[PDB]
Amino acid sequence: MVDAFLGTWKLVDSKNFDDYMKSLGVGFATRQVASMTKPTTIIEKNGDILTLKTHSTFKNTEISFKLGVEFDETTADDRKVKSIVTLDGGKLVHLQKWDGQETTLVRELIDGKLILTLTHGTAVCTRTYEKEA
Ligand SMILES: CCCCCCCCC(=O)O
Ligand SMILES: CCCCCCCCC(=O)O
C-alpha cells in the first residue's frame, strides 16, 4: 500500500534540520555540511521488502525492511537503533528506539511532494522532496 512513495526523490526545502541534528548530539562541523547537502532518496519495493537509499556528497545510507517488522539500523549519525516502519493514515512512519530515546521519521505525500517530518525531543524538522522522472 506504499506505492505512490516509490521512486527517486530530491531534497528541495528544509526547515529546522539543524535543531533536529543538534537534539541528536550531532557535532557542529557535521551539522554545517549537512545544512548544505541535498540528498537523493530512493524508495523501492520487491514484494514485501522495501529498500530506502539516501545518497549525498557527504554520507550515504541504505536500509531494507519488511512493514511492521522490527529491524536493526545504524543511522547516518552512527546511532545503533531498533527500527520499525509502518503505514499510518497513509503516512510512512519510521520509529527508531535506542537507550530509551525515540525519534520518528514520518513521510506524507502532499500535492505530489514527499514531506519528511523528523521529530526528536522537542525538535521538529520538515524536509520536502520532489520526485525525479
Ligand atoms: C542526525 C540524524 C540524521 C539522520 C537522518 C536524517 C535524514 C534526513 C533525510 O533523509 O533528508
Ligand atoms: C545520508 C545522507 C544524510 C546527509 C545529512 C545528515 C547527516 C547527519 C550526520 O552525519 O550526522
From Swiss-Prot:
SUPFAM superfamilies membership: Lipocalins
InterPro entries listed in its UniProt record: Calycin, Fatty_acid-bd, ILBP, Lipocln_cytosolic_FA-bd_dom
Gene Ontology MF terms in the entry: cytoskeletal protein binding; icosatetraenoic acid binding; long-chain fatty acid binding; long-chain fatty acid transmembrane transporter activity; oleic acid binding
Residues bearing the modification N-acetylvaline: 2
UniProt-annotated binding residues for (9Z)-octadecenoate: 127-129
Keywords on record: Acetylation, Cytoplasm, Lipid-binding, Phosphoprotein, Transport
GO term, biological process aspect, one: positive regulation of phospholipid biosynthetic process
Chain positions found as Phosphothreonine: 8, 30
UniProt note: domains: Forms a beta-barrel structure that accommodates the hydrophobic ligand in its interior.
The name this protein goes by in its record: Fatty acid-binding protein, heart
Species this protein is from: Homo sapiens (Human)
